[PDB]
Each structure stands twice: as C-alpha cells, then as structure tokens.
Amino acid sequence: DLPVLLTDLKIQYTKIFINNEWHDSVSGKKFPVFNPATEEELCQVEEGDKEDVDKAVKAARQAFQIGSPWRTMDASERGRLLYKLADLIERDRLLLATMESMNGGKLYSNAYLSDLAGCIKTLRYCAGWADKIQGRTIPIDGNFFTYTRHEPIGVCGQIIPWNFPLVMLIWKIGPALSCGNTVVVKPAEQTPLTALHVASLIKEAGFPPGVVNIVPGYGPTAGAAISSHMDIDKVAFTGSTEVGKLIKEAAGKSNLKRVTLELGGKSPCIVLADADLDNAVEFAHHGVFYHQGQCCIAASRIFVEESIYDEFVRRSVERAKKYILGNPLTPGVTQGPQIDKEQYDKILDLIESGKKEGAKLECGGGPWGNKGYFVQPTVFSNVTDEMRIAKEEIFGPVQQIMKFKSLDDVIKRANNTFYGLSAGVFTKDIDKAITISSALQAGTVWVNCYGVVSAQCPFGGFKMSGNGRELGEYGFHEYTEVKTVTVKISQKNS
Amino acid sequence: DLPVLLTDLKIQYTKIFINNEWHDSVSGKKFPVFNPATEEELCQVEEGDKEDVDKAVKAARQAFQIGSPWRTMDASERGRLLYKLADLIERDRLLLATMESMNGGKLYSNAYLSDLAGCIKTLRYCAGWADKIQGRTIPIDGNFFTYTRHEPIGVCGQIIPWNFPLVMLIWKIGPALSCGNTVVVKPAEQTPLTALHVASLIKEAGFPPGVVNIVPGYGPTAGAAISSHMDIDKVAFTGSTEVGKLIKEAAGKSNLKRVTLELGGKSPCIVLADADLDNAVEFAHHGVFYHQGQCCIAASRIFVEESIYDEFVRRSVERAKKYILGNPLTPGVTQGPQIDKEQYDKILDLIESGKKEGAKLECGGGPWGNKGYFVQPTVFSNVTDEMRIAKEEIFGPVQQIMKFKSLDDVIKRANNTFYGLSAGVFTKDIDKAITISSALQAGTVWVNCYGVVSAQCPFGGFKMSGNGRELGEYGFHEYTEVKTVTVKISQKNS
Amino acid sequence: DLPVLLTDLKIQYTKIFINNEWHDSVSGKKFPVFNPATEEELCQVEEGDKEDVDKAVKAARQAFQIGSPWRTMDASERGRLLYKLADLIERDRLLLATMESMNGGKLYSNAYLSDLAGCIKTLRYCAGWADKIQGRTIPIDGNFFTYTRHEPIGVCGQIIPWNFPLVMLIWKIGPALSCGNTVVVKPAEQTPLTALHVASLIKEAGFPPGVVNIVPGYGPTAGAAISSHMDIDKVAFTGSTEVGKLIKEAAGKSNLKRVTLELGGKSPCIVLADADLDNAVEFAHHGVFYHQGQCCIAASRIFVEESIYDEFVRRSVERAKKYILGNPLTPGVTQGPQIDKEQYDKILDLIESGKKEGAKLECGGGPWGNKGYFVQPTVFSNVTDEMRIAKEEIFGPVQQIMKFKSLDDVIKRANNTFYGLSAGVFTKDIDKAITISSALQAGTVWVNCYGVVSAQCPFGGFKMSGNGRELGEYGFHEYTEVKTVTVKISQKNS
Amino acid sequence: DLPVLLTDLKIQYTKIFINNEWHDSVSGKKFPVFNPATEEELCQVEEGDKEDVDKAVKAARQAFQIGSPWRTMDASERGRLLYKLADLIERDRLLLATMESMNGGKLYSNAYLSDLAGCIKTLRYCAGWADKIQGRTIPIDGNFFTYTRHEPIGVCGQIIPWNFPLVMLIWKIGPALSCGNTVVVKPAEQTPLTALHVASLIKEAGFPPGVVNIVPGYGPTAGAAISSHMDIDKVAFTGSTEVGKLIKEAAGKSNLKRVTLELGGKSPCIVLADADLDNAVEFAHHGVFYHQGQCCIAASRIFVEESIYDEFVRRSVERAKKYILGNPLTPGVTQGPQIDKEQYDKILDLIESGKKEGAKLECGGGPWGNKGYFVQPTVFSNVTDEMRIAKEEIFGPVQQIMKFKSLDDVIKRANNTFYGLSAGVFTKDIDKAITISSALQAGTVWVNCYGVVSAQCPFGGFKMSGNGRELGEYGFHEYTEVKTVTVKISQKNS
Ligand SMILES: NC(=O)c1ccc[n+]([C@@H]2O[C@H](COP(=O)([O-])OP(=O)(O)OC[C@H]3O[C@@H](n4cnc5c(N)ncnc54)[C@H](O)[C@@H]3O)[C@@H](O)[C@H]2O)c1
Ligand SMILES: CCCn1c(NCc2cccc(OC)c2O)nc2ccccc21
Ligand SMILES: [Cl-]
Ligand SMILES: [Cl-]
Ligand SMILES: [Cl-]
Ligand SMILES: [Cl-]
Ligand SMILES: [Yb+3]
C-alpha cells in the first residue's frame, strides 16, 4: 500500500553544502526552482558557480589527503556510514518522495515505491562492497613480490540530471564513497532540492566533512567548472549526448581527468511472432511511457514481426488510451508533466515531425491542460527508419511501432544507430533469445521483459550512449585507481 | 580425416618413474597388462607398492622444498613447460592414441580425435593459468597491510581410472602443476602404458626431477599407500563410489589430507514434448553409449514425455542397431570391448536384472564374440525407478528409457538418487530450460545437448558423485592453499 | 568504556530450536550446564540426540526445497535478514556478553568488547556478500552458451566448540546463510546458552522456519548423528584434531558429505634480533595467554634469536606476573578459569611434563583457588623441540620460549609439526619478513603483530590444523556448490 | 650469450597492411625512414593518410561482424593464434632485434635480450587469457536470470610511439586480440619497419584478414584520422601529453569513442638513509639512463636523504662516466643515439636550462660525434623543484639528484607534479616501504628496485600520465565491453 505525508511539505535546505556546512553563493545570487505541474516557483536556491565549485573541490581534496579520517578509517566503517545513510533515507522516505514528486514532476506512487526503494537498495548494495574492494598478489617474473592496491581515485565531480534526481544522486555517490573517493556533486538546476536534503542526512550520518559536497547551480557555469577543473580527478555524468561531448572535450583540454558518461538512447525492441504477445505489449508500453518518456532506456523503437504487427499496434493503442493526466501528487493520476519548457517544446516539435514525415498517428499528438508541461501520450504506427521520431531521442510520451519480416534485417536496423544503451527481445525460442541478445549492440538486453534495473547489475552504453559501467561488481572498477607495488626480494617461492 | 601409425606399436616404458629416472619395483615384482579386445598380454610392468610410493613421495617432497627449482621458477615458466608437454603429446599423437586404443579397448577414431585432442587442449588451457593464479590485497579492519598467497598445496597423490587414462592423467597433472604442486600419480592397473609414455615426455620437456612421479600398480596396494600416506598433502581420485569412501576414510585416519573425488553417476535426461526429437534422441544415445558406456556422465536414465515416448523409444532402438563390434583399431568398427572381466560380469548381471525385474528388452541383451569383453548394445524400455538398471551405475552399453507425464514429478525422480554428476534437459522453451536446469541436483546440466566437456568449464559432482571441481577457473582453487599474511603498520590509507 | 548489565541475568531459552519453535528432547532428557568459575549449575537444557537431529535435518531440508521462501527470496533479502540479526545482537550485547562470560568462563571485558563486536562485524560483513555471490559466463569451445551457478550446497551441519561460542556460531552461520544454505548447529555441550538466545533473535529477525535449527547436546550423540547423517550435505567443525578425524571418517562412511575442519595448532613465533623487542614480547604474550590459552592460534612456541633471548624471557616473565585471577564478571579481573575438568586436568598434566622433561619454570606451574578451574599463568624457558609442551597443544595459560641462532634451522623447527594454523614473524627487515612468511607452513602469518583476525580475511589451517578456509571472499566458496549449465546454440559469437 | 644476424639485414615490408594484403597509399606518396645513429635513409614506406585509415577501418569492421571467423572461432583458438605469433617472432628474433636496433637507435644487446623477450613473453601471456575472459551470473532482485557478456569492443585504433616500437605494438595488439577485437595500428613515423614485419607474421600465423591492419604514416594525418574516425570504437595511445589531449578532444568531438592513454612522466625516487646505497644508486641510474633516457618511467627526479646525498651523487657520477657511445649494433657500445632531431634539440635545450637555472653539472652537458643524434650522459646535482629539468620530461640521458631531510616534505615534493606514472622507494624499513608506497601518487611503485615491468602486472598512470591500465588481469578490462542480459523467468531459485 501507499502511505502519504500528513502535513504539507516545507522546504528547508536551499544552500550550498561544503565541509558539512551550509554556504551562501560567493556571488550572493540565487535561482528559482519550479513545480512542472503548476509552473509555479517552489523556492529559491543558492546559485553555485566556478568560485563555489573551487571551494568544494578544495574541501574534497583536503578530505582525501593521506592521513585524513576518510582515508584512514576502516573500509568496513565507510560501509557502515553508507548503511546508516540508507537507514536515514528510509526514515525520510515520505518527505523525500513528496519533494521528488513536487520538484521533479514525478508520479508520487512511482517516487515512493520505485525511486526511493531503489535509492535505499542501491545504497545498501554499495555499503556491502566497501570492505570487499580488493587488489591482487601477482606471480611476476623475477625475484619480486608484486601486489596491487585498488585505491580510490580522489576527487570525483558528479553531474546529475533532472529525470531521476535521487536515484542518479545515489548511483553516483554510493559507489564513489564505497571505494573511498570524495565527491563534488552538481544536481540539475531544475531539481536541486532532494539532493540538498540528502546532504542533511550525510551530515547526520557522520560522514567526515568534505567527503560529500553539493553545489546546486547551472550547467554552463558550475557544470563547466567541474568539467575543466584542474584538481578534479574524475567526472561522471548522465544527460544529453551534446553535453557529454562538451565535458569530454573540457576534460581533455584541462587535466585529462577520467570521464564516464551515460547519454541516453534510442533503444529498440524486437518482437518475434512466437512471443507472449500481451507480455510483450505491456513491457514495451511501460518501457517507452515510464516517467512520461523521460527515461534513458525508453523503448522508443518497437519492431514487430508482420504476422502479429497489427494486433500489437491495436493492443498498444488500447493501453495508451487509459491514462489520467494531472498533478503527480493526486492518487489515481497516472501521467505527470514533462520537466520544463525546453523538453516540452522538443517533444511537440518531434511529434509534429512524425505527422509531417508520414507516420500514422494512432492516438494523442498534442499538449494538454491549462498549466503544467503536459503532453498527451502518443503512439505512431508505420514508422520508418529515416524519420526523426525513429532517429532522435524524444524523452517524451511518444511510442514508435515498426514492422519487420526478416530477422537478419531487423537486427541491422536495431543496430543502425549511434545510440546503444539497451534493447529488448521477445520470443519463446531459446536459440533466438541467446543469439539475438548476443548480436544487439546494447549495454543491457532484456529478454521477455523491459526496464529491469537492479543494483547487482552493471549498467551503461555501447557506442555514443556512453562509456563505462555503473553499479554491479564491474561498475566499482571505475571508482578505483590501480597501483602496482613491486618489491625486490632475495628469492621468491610459489 | 583420420591418420594412422604406419609401423606397428612397440612398448618401451614399463618402469616406475621417480626423480625423472626409471626404477624397478623394490620387490622386483612385475604385473601383466592386457588388450581387452583380444584377452592377450601386451607386456609386463613394474609393480609399485607401498615401498615405491614412499620413494615417490620423498622425491615429490624434495622437489617441493622452499628454494627448489620448481618452487623458485617463474610461474610463466611452469606454464611454458606445460605448453611444451602439450606440444610433445601432439608430436606423439599417433603413437599415444594407438597405445590408448590397444591397452584401453578404446575406439581409435575416438582416441585420436577426442581423447588426444582433449589432452592437448586441456594442457594448453592449464598452461595459460600458471602465471594468472593470484591472491588478494584485503582492506582489513585496523592499521594492518593484509595480503594472501594462493600457494601450491604440496605433494598431491592422483589415482587415475582405466576408462579415460590419458585424459584423466592430464586433468589431474595439468592443474596441479600449473599451480605449482608436485605429484605422485597411480594409473589404473589395467592401463599404465600411456601414462608411462607421458612420463617420457615430462622428462623430455625439462620438468625438474621429482615434480611428476608415476607409480603403476594395484589399488589396494599402491593406491592405499597414497590414501594413507602421512606426507601426501592432497589426494584426487576418479573411480568407483566404493573406493572413494575407502580413500576418504584412509585420509581421515592418517593425516587429514585434502580429498577431492569424482565417483560416477546415474545421470538423467528430461525430454519435453516440445523438444527437437531427433536432436534429443541422438544426444541421449551418444550420452549413454559413448566409449561402450564406460563414462562417468553416461545418460543412463532417459525420461520422455508420454506424448513422444513411443516415437523416442522407436528411434533410439533404430540408432542402437547400427553398431559394428570388433577390434577398436580396425577402421569402421564402432564399438569396442569393455575393459576387463569384472566390468563385463557386472554389465551382464545388471542386464539380467533388467530382464527379470520386468524391463522391456528392445535390442541386445547378451555378450558377443569369440574373444574380447564385448557386450551387445542394449536398450530397455518401460524401466521403473525401483529396478536395479535404474538405480545402479552400469558402466556398459545399456540404455534405460522411462516415461513421465508430470514435470514436477519427473524432476523429483531425476533427483531421487545419491548420484549427482550431470543431467540433460531437452526443450525449446526458455523458461523450462532455465528453471529445470536450476532445479536438477547435478554438477553439469546440458540443455539440448549432452556430454559436452571442455577445459574452460568446471566439472564435478553433487552429492555422492563426488566433491570439488576440476578444470575451469574454479577447479584451480582445489590445487592451492591460501595463506593470509597480515603486517602491522603505523597507519593505513585506503 | 565498559557498560554492564544492570539487572541480574535470567536464563530463558533452554530448548531445542527447530522450524523456529522450541522443542523438548524426544527422550525427555535434559543436561546440566555449569559456570566454570564457580563449578555451580546455571540451568538445565534439553538434550538433543540422533532423533532430534533427524527432526532438525528434515526441517532444514524442507526449507531448502526448490520453490521455498529461503530459496526464492532475493539474495539482497538474505543479506537484509543477516544485517537485522546483527542489529539485534547489538541490541542484546550486554545480555549476550554477560551470558557468554558466565557460561564460558570468559573475561567480560573481552566478551563485550571483542567477542560481541566480532560477532556483529562478521554478520554485517557476511550480509554484504549475499547478493555479490556470482558465477561465470564461460567461452567454452564449440557452439554453446555456458554459464555457472554458485548455488548453496544445502543442509549444513555445524559443530561448534566451547572456547568462542558466539563467535564460532556466527563464523559458521553467517557465510552459510549468506550463500543460501540451511543449517543444523550443535553447540558445545558446555556452552549452549548464547546460541539458544541467538536462535530467539533469528526468529525475531524473520528468517523462514527451518533455515536455522539449533540442537544442543553431546558430541558422541548429537555430533555423531550429524557426522553420519545421510541427508546432510556438508559438515563444518572446529575443535580437537581427534574429533576431526572421527567426523571425516563418519562422513566418508555415510554419504561422502563435504567436510571442512579447523583443529587447533602449535603455532610458532620467530623473533629476529632486529625486532622491536617490546612489541614482540607484548604480542607473543597476548598470543599465548589470550582467553586463558584456549585459542586455536595460541602462540605456543616462541623462538627468539640468542642475542636477545635472555632479555625476551625476562620481559615475558615480568608481564606474565601481572595477572589477577577470579570471576570473569568482576571488573579488573584479568584471567578467568579454564572451561571444565577435562581441560584443567590436561593443562596440569602437560605443565608437569614440562617440569619432569627438563624445562625451566620461570613462574606459575600450579592450580589456583578454592573453586573454579583456575591455572596459574605459567612460563617455561629453555624448551626443546622434543618435549611434550613443545609438541602438544596445551589450550591453557602456558608459554614456551626457545632460543635459536640459525634462521634456516629455526624455520625447519617452526615447520616441524603436523599443525599449521598460524605463525608470527618479528623483524624490521623487509626481505626477511616476506621470505620467512612465505616459507612458514601456516594458514595465517602475522608480521610484527599476532592474533589479528578480521571478517575480511580468510582463516584456516595448513596440514592437520584443518582443511578449507572461513570468512573473507575465499571462505564463501566452501558454502557453495558449482553447477555448470551448457546450452547448445546455432552459432556463438565472442 | 648474445647471438647476431650473420647476413646483412634486407628490408622487405614497406607497404600498408589491410585485409592481410599489401597496399600502396591511395595518394601514391611514400616517406623516408632513417637510421638515427647515421642520419642516413634506410628505405621508403607507403605514407598512410585518412583515405588509407578509412580502408583499414572498413576491413576491421568487416572482420568484427557477427558471424565472421574472428567472432565465431573458439576463444581458445584466438589464444592459439597469439601463441603461434609469439613462436614466429621468436623464430625471427635475430632479424627483428637487428631491425629494431637499426631503425630505432636501440642498443642491440637490449633489443635482443629485453625488447624481443618482452614481446614474446607478453604475447604468450595474452594468449593464455583469451579463453579465460569471463562474465558473471548475477543474483538480481526479482524473478529474472541475469548474466553478463564481456564482449570485445570492436575496432580499436592503436597509435604507437618510436621509443619501444615492437614492445608497444605487442602491448597493444596482444590484449586487444586476446579479447576478440580488431585493430588498426599506426606505428610511429620514425619506426614503421618492425611493425610491418610483424604484419608478415600475422598473415603467416593464420589470423583472419582484417583482424590486424597496420597503416604507417604521420601523426597529424593518419593518427588524427584514427582519433576522429566515426567507426572506431576505441583508441589507445602512448606518447606525448600534448597529443593525448589532442586525441581525447578528437574522440569527444566525433563519436565519443573510448580512450586510454599513457603519457610519460616525471617519476621520482625516494632514497632513505637506511637504504642499500649501492643497490639504490644502480637502480636509479638504470631507471633514468635506460634506452638513452627515452623511457616513460625514467627516474628523472632522485631525492636522497641528506646524510647520504653526497656519497649518492659521487657514486652516480662515477657510474655515469663509464659509457661508450656509438652505433647501437657494435658489441660493447653502451649508449646509442636519440631518435631524431626534435628530441635531440629538446634534450640539449633542457640541459642548457639546467645550467642557466643554477643546477650543478657533474658530468656530460653537451652533444657527441660527427653524425647521429648523440647526447653525452649528463648528471645534475643540487636540482631544485622549480627548475625546468625538475618539471619537464626530458626523454634524454639526463639525471637530476636532489636532497631532502624531511620525509613528510619529500613525499609532497614527489607528488607535486601533474605526472604520475611510476616511483621508486629505497629503504630497508618495512613500515616505511608500505606507507611511502601507499602515499605516492603513481601507477607503479618499485621498492628497492626500479624499472621492473612484466606482463602479469597492470601498468599505467595516475593523473596526467594517463588513464586506464595495460596488461595484467586488470588491463584486459579495457578491451572489453560489458553487456548485461536479463531474462524474465517464472520463478528463480538461489
Ligand atoms: N610515454 C612514452 O613512452 C612517450 C613516447 C614518446 C614520446 N613521449 C613524450 O613526447 C615527447 C615528444 O615526442 P613525439 O613528438 O615523437 O611524440 P608524439 O606523441 O607526437 O608521437 C607518438 C605517436 O603519436 C602520433 N601523433 C603525433 N601527432 C598526432 C596527432 N595530431 N594525432 C594523432 N596522432 C599523432 C605520432 O605519429 C606517433 O605515432 C617526448 O619528448 C616524450 O616526452 C612519451
Ligand atoms: C626499463 C624497462 C624497459 N621497458 C621494457 N622492456 C622490455 C620488456 C621486458 C619484460 C617484459 C615486457 O613486457 C611486459 C617488456 O616490454 N618494456 C617497457 C614498457 C614500458 C616502459 C618501459 C619498458
Ligand atoms: Cl589488479
Ligand atoms: Cl584470498
Ligand atoms: Cl565458476
Ligand atoms: Cl560483469
Ligand atoms: Yb650534425
């Protein structure tokens, strides 16, 4: 069941968080934060810029110094601190999910039952790794003793998007901290509020000062200061392909800092004629419409074998027509607004491209409501590979359905994109499930499901959907720096 | 294609191999070795007993001493020696396969194309691991530096069976040597000859003396001396369940040496109605009839969904009727003899149990020929779970076919055995393949195939089919002893 | 600081724990449990025997069945249950440490600050592994998809000793449960009480019934029923070398169950002339006198370079003369009783052997007090390798100090034992620390410290000190059974 | 001993290698290749440019297609091909070492005994990993089966420097191929010749066409075409910090390809007063003077405790005065030329900076000879942290020796650089060796040695010395792309 907050939400944390203390901006400037369902201002927040990032990096550097509390404490104690943080987020789950829904335009049902649960579970998963990060002893040639340290890297700048503010915050800080790094986080200008509340809880949990610093502010200002900073060792980023390139270029130009990116997708589904049809329709629908289409792994190209294409389209239209738009905080509402005017415009323009380029509009196709950035859930049939709605990430509630009859050819079509984040395959045939999944150039492939993400799984893109992996055993590698220590000895023995 | 030896085989190596030199038995006694297809003596071999095992252990201990060549050489050089050994076995492939076929009663086609290839591939696989065996550096609580060494264990006694003499020899010595152990090998009394030729090649490859010692002889004599030896650190064994118990009891009684066993099976296949029927018939047939049924993983219980049972039986009988019995060295012969009189008697007695207990004899059922331990390939239909041919490992060319209609119940029947070595599942359904394979209590489960063994895969039994795993990454663990080194330091840093 | 329980301890849990319910013994029999510091009975406990073990195994088997809650719950939820159990033991830390001290004769300071802390930390460590136990995908030869499952083994029987009742309980159940096994635990007849209280907390934490079953009782009765049980898949044991052999023999005779043992030691220290002398004296003293000498890793042979031997002996005698004997619950008491009459007799007899065989008694040498199994802390100088106090594990407060001058020779002396659990090396020289530690045949080697045990480190014996490893990454391997699944596919791709 | 080629070297392979065939440049243009010891032209080579890189990428892409020989062959066969290549390089060791010495200006003794041996050993090491690259099976939340594939990435562009042509070639192609990638290699314009001979041997070994393509040519032309190519999935590079930035910027701008860099260093040694002084002098000398100073890990800042500084300097000057300059092919010659005029000028300019900025010139300081790019081996004493010879990588035979007295301060000085490739620590004290090595911000730290590189060790930079690691287990991660496959199932079981 679905509990709610019983007193109205009051916003408290609006300042920059450095050395576990709350800071005004060096400039004195603040910026507004809005509710996307009402277009009304919720509060003002201190606007971080290069001077504030500089303060946060110096604090993160000082907390990372050899001999510091965060460097010398037991690994197991880093893990305890992360488990306590998860306990505290659990405690404040009602408040955080409400704030997430109100600032982010996110259905409260999903914010409470999915986002917040995933934040808690991911933190507890990361806590468990902290004292299980291990190097190696190595039987090198010659009379030497050689071992490796999987050290933390150092100061990690972490630029977060607006579509999953808390979840991206925890996906970034959980592994970074578990491995022993210090972090400077720049949440989305649209959604700073839940991150600043979590900073409240980082202080309360007892993390040493400077281990986590949160600098709300804008992209070209505070984000770019992180990108180009000469004393940040690594930057991680989720967001647009265009910013990813600007960050990688900034990193190369300054100090050759390590960079990992996750950059969205144009993720395809392949539905074979032998698929459980209803199960395939339901998962592909959820794949593309989840959180108003504002998901990196949105299932935005659905290829269906011709034998079942018309039934698939018909059943998808029926399911898309069952939504209730409105304020994401009211029970029974099933689709909230898009995040802001930029994204709203982009979606409507792409919808229009679909009409003009010859797609078949099955439902939706326009905006909704007196206020709020609402888009009707929209389904296009007979989409072809050349159209803009087939090539460009939409990030809105807009489903594309295509037909195929040759399996060889539909795999090339699925792979014929610079994106590569995820894909889905729907079949009952063992051999097809394995060989299709092996052939798809995508970081996660779901078989007879879609959108299944868990802390135990590495997650990331092929090709221009990004580089590196997050979470799982494998994602922890990207938050360590390997040092080889080789000691001369008089005689080695196996 | 299938090349052959162009001059008749001459036997050269018949003595005990210790410190890379050839030894007469301390007693002076020798024992005969026979050809199972003719019942004729091939040669005499030095008979090892406790006094000879004692000599081999002392040499293996001396080669394992700290500061010795085998302990101090680079890991990568251990690997080079194993690759050279594989090169030499490749060179002598015609001779070894001929000797294997003549001493072991093994089809020459299979000895040359399967056994010898697997020996070569397994050695090269093991060679590659030698300098990739690694310990760990560990973020222990407190101000300490902690690392682990995955050392070799020490002197490993390795008791080999007669059904795959070369392959079992290499499965044992490949991982043992790669990890840095020294070994005392006791090949089957029935099949010492290929092992002694490989000892020729171990000397030729340059292995330091005492690293490999081979002591041909009998089980209750030389085998038991290994089992109960107070200076052997580990014993590995493949063979009967009954000897496994005698070895484990001997080990516990003497020096608590480490023990790994592989002990055969009563491995089941489950054939669902949606299976590729011909593919299932072919693989299950090969599973149970390979090497005259003398395989640990023989598919000796085949459960078939009632819908397809009668067709399955009919097609299996047709395939079983296509064999040519005779000397395993003549081209076109497709079934050789059983290994000796004990096994031959055991098979015929169990065949008779099948008749008397009410099984349906579809073909075969008796012996064959003027000489040689030949058994007609035999198929039983309508087998029930209580019969001896359903409960006891036969190790002969004897196939059991049963019907089921409830999948829940057939999984319990498949699992209702103290054996647990392997199993097979035949279905096109993804979900059934995964959930059935997960539910079966068996060390290897094949899906839509059977009998697929490779050096990259760990291999071993559940339950009384044995303990531990051989080959793969995982099997290397059982040839190392982990040492934790924990060093006090003034201050640790992550 | 050191808090205490403010009301006297009341014993509540005295029955057999099966399917999360409290059971009388099938026989109706109970047995007394005593306080070793007073020789007075504390309470009576239900006496488990073969019939009760049979009940516990059936429940553990049923909880392990495919489809059961414990088999189907998320791995991460197994970990949550273990973290909650740790939270509950933390809650009851005062009660548990008091009960541990009163039943076990264990200094309350140590029980509270060391045993209980280690129990809590070890559980939290094990919790973190639960959803990080992973198998492999393997690039086998041929057109196959091959993966491995690291399944739980099944029903694990766990026989616990009296010297560290809670810590051994958690060392056993933490990894077993994390990996997904079910357990039947048989605590020491002398110390059932803390285990039964923990069973209270396993129920309270929400573990499914039958996952943990605790059967207090005697060794030759309930212990032997576990050893020889035909439906227990694995047995783990810590205790005497003599029982280890009886367990391994019992396992071999019945169902070839997997066996891991830890069997004590005769662990040596090597003190070089360049060692920090005071640091070496302090750690070796603690090594041998900790918990009245009743530690598996007791530093019971201390070899000291002749240059510093007399100073080392003198300083060790001074430190041994500073103890206060008495009831382990009174503040300032620094040495408690031995556990029972058997151990007390054994210690006094061995002390007498030391006198008669010619050792130099420096202090102690006799019993103490009106009541309680107290032994004076005792130091022997000029010990030689032939004496009983040099060869036999004493398990009492009895220190042996020997001189050496040749480093080659003292390593052979240190290694000249069938034991092999641990060792210590004291030197400032890098090269000596590495090469000596590499040469010692011991499972853990401490350098410039002693007795440093942590959940992140694997722990176990070389040679007759046992087989397998506990805790660390590596120890988790011994609570899994590897299954290889190999799937035929039309075409594989790298 | 040191065998030599008995007939003069004849150059044969001068063309572009694509699809295992030899190609003229699209332009028809060729470029000269010189001997640095004589300044004479050795031959002309086809000049690759963007059009030729385009041809090589298309071939590498085609060889990487699903269903291709290189994608479908057994992993173990990829390893066989790499072992055969190593066998062939061994066969041609005399020719390759001669060609390496003549084109690269590299002492023939070192080319034959070190470079060529390292090439052979590294290939054999990489061969062994090929069928040991494994993914995972993962206990994800929910009723799913989740596994990972560690796939090859795809087409990898590999830009090689002139200082270790063969060794860098093999460090790049060995791991790339072992993991299953295809490669487009661009050797240094100064040293294409040994790479083109190895391409001869790749064809001879049987690698499928298009798996390895070698495009000799210039940096701003063919190198930049690789950097910015829209169908290259990854680029690896060793060379200058300045090009690294140009490559990272090019990659970000085009297709966000993965990038790993190794970019040289300013690697420091710390020599404590208790060090084995002669051992420290010898290793630091070799560290900075090896291959005429043209090593990434050159020990170009040597900090020595004041107590021993003057003796250290004196002994280093004595050892530096013992060199014989001349043609690297004549026996007994111990220092060859620098590679070309650019590097020669850079070294002399930096030497002059040392004089003018106030360093103490102890020996050398000018050029040498009638012809060839020879620099006198040069030692500077009393170097301070501000001078150019302390800050800038020299890549010439130029040693800097500084004094320290505070260990805290000398660690900050050692770390006060944007470089971070390697470091050395010389002490007998265990605690100092561990804590100093832990505090140094460097990818490899040697203790009481220097310059010890082996295939089993990961190798790479901290900070601006580069990103990622090469060789070892860990370096293989950077040649794979992880795919998560998550399959919906009816019910999971642990
Ligand atoms: N880390 C090393 O081992 C290493 C090796 C060589 C040079 N260096 C450093 O670089 C300094 C200058 O030497 P250099 O100019 O010969 O090195 P460089 O970086 O320019 O050349 C090395 C490789 O990079 C290529 N390259 C050059 N420009 C390129 C471009 N725009 N795009 C793509 N590839 C390009 C070159 O053709 C060559 O293959 C040296 O003095 C040294 O300090 C380091
Ligand atoms: C001062 C070291 C010279 N040196 C060598 N010598 C050849 C060599 C020898 C052994 C193993 C090798 O590969 C693992 C190998 O390449 N290779 C280097 C790579 C980078 C920096 C310096 C190098
Ligand atoms: Cl590593
Ligand atoms: Cl380990
Ligand atoms: Cl495995
Ligand atoms: Cl993975
Ligand atoms: Yb000149």
Side-chain angles (χ1 to χ4, degrees), chain C residues 94 114 124 137 180 190 255 265 283 318 350 414 423 446:
Chain C
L94 291 170
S114 294
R124 289 176 174 157
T137 57
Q190 297 89 342
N255 72 341
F283 266 112
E318 202 190 301
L350 276 161
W446 296 288

Side-chain angles (χ1 to χ4, degrees), chain A residues 378-399:
Chain A
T378 296
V379 176
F380 284 113
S381 148
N382 298 334
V383 176
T384 57
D385 290 346
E386 41 98 348
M387 280 136 89
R388 283 184 77 227
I389 56 180
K391 284 152 80 180
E392 296 182 24
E393 185 176 59
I394 296 162
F395 253 55
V398 187
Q399 179 177 50

Side-chain angles (χ1 to χ4, degrees), chain A residues 23-74:
Chain A
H23 285 250
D24 298 327
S25 56
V26 171
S27 70
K29 294 154 40 52
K30 311 160 108 96
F31 67 100
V33 187
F34 296 96
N35 183 335
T38 73
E39 289 177 51
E40 284 319 323
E41 174 184 312
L42 277 165
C43 72
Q44 302 275 339
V45 168
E46 304 297 317
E47 199 200 316
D49 207 334
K50 185 191 137 196
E51 319 97 271
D52 310 276
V53 168
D54 278 343
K55 283 167 62 184
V57 170
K58 295 178 300 228
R61 176 60 59 195
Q62 179 59 57
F64 192 75
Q65 289 309 113
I66 290 280
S68 81
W70 189 243
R71 294 299 300 278
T72 63
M73 73 166 59
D74 298 334

